Write a protein that binds this ligand. Structure first.
Ligand SMILES: N[C@@H](CCC(=O)O)C(=O)O
Ligand SMILES: N[C@@H](CCC(=O)O)C(=O)O
Lengths: 251, 256
């Protein structure tokens, strides 16, 4: 019979996945544009699948509690409510306990999103002072990096972000960018995103360099044939310069 | 007193370069660049003096048919240097034989070529004939192509290695000159491409990155400075000092 349509879990994040503006209503995948949708169209054609894009209901990437229970897109994959997660989702060893990733299609690191023309030049500068609040998206890999760090400065930063985490952690990056613009708040954010945001907001900058180095990959349930298949299709797109043309379009 | 460490390195802009002077210079004062600043910062943290020695064959390091290494990799294996502080790519094949610190910079292989052509990818170079292409002989880019099992890259390796490897170049400066003066594209690491295209505005990076790797400080297996260098790199990172060094040596006016 015809191929079962894949369910693709994703999350709203500029410029990876965004709502298309329209006079008329938009249904299905047509609700959506961005780097990840173009990626998905390419993967969809090289491998030949139809797909349904579903936004993760809780709107989170995925972190685990102390009982080993996950949420976000990670959970959607574990529980087979999705075949693939195609989003700016960080490949990490922790998540590899429970899901698979394709090889990476983009590389990145954690850095700071803050405002231009300040004394603040680094992580040490942020941790040491008081007036500027800082944190990360709740239940994403940046928050998890700090929560697990044994590095003395980052441990202090997690204590602060964790010492009332209701003021410091943000539900999403967009919520995150507002505090930046509005309050004295510095947002711990992935460099790919920081790049995009500052080309589009001229009061905003990256601060310091990368504090780590990671990749985004396509997520699958553990053992899925689509993992190796998507690794192969991503290599093809690298060969074709097609991922590069994708990045130039959206950034 | 503490033995002065021997540091193997290689000329490569802007990591390690001869400082300009009207007199000839000696010892460490000969050199400047990102890697010399990194070394100043490492030596303070760990408490050593160092002696900078350019790798005698001017190669980074690759293994021949007989399993024999050359380059800075060989200097380390043979214990002719304590440390390699250079833009030295951390690879699985080198990790079989020397150790590395955590990376201090990340990069990926890409393509340096002239601005204004239709070439936009490795596929486009690999399919055609008119434009010659290759990499620095006995460096990790050459090795990546040499060992690739990916069809496009195997073809590219067959080509750049044909006619007695005439498409390869001895060093990056020779490759950049080759790009500038003939119809030639250089397979080069992105950090280096970024430096070069700001200073040669008729050149550009083609396609994106075709792999993802790091530079790290190389030491012999077992070295009792390896983990201490990693701890220092970590400190430099949190303090923002790596980023400040990168700005010092890369940043300037974008192309008109
Ligand atoms: N890419 C991150 C989301 C954003 C962040 O945590 O900074 C993840 O997969 O969790
Ligand atoms: N960084 C490379 C040299 C440059 C190149 O191979 O493109 C190495 O460690 O061999």
């Amino acid at each position: 019979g015809a191929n079962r349509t894949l369910i693709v879990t994703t999350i709203l994040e500029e410029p990876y996945v965004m709502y298309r503006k329209s006079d008329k209503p938009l249904y299905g995948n047509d609700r959506f544009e961005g780097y990840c949708l173009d990626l998905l169209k390419e993967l969809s054609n090289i491998l030949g699948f139809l797909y349904d894009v579903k936004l993760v209901p809780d709107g989170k990437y995925g972190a685990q509690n102390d009982k080993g229970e996950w949420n976000g897109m990670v959970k959607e994959l574990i529980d087979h409510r999705a075949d693939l997660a195609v989003a700016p989702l960080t490949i990490t060893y922790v998540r590899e306990k429970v899901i698979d990733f394709s090889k990476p299609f983009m590389t990145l690191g954690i850095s700071i999103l803050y405002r231009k023309g300040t004394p603040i030049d680094s992580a040490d500068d942020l941790a040491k002072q008081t007036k500027i609040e800082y944190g990360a998206v709740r239940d994403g890999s940046t928050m998890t990096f700090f929560k697990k760090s044994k590095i003395s400065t980052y441990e202090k930063m997690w204590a602060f972000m964790s010492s009332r985490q209701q003021s410091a952690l943000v539900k999403n990056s967009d919520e995150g960018i507002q505090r930046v613009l509005t309050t004295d708040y510095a947002l711990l954010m992935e460099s790919t995103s920081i790049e995009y945001v500052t080309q589009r907001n001229c009061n905003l900058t990256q601060i310091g360099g990368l504090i780590d180095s990671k990749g985004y990959g396509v997520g699958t349930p553990i053992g899925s044939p689509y993992r190796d298949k998507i690794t192969i299709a991503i290599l093809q797109l690298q060969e074709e310069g097609k991922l590069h043309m994708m990045k130039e379009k959206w950034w």
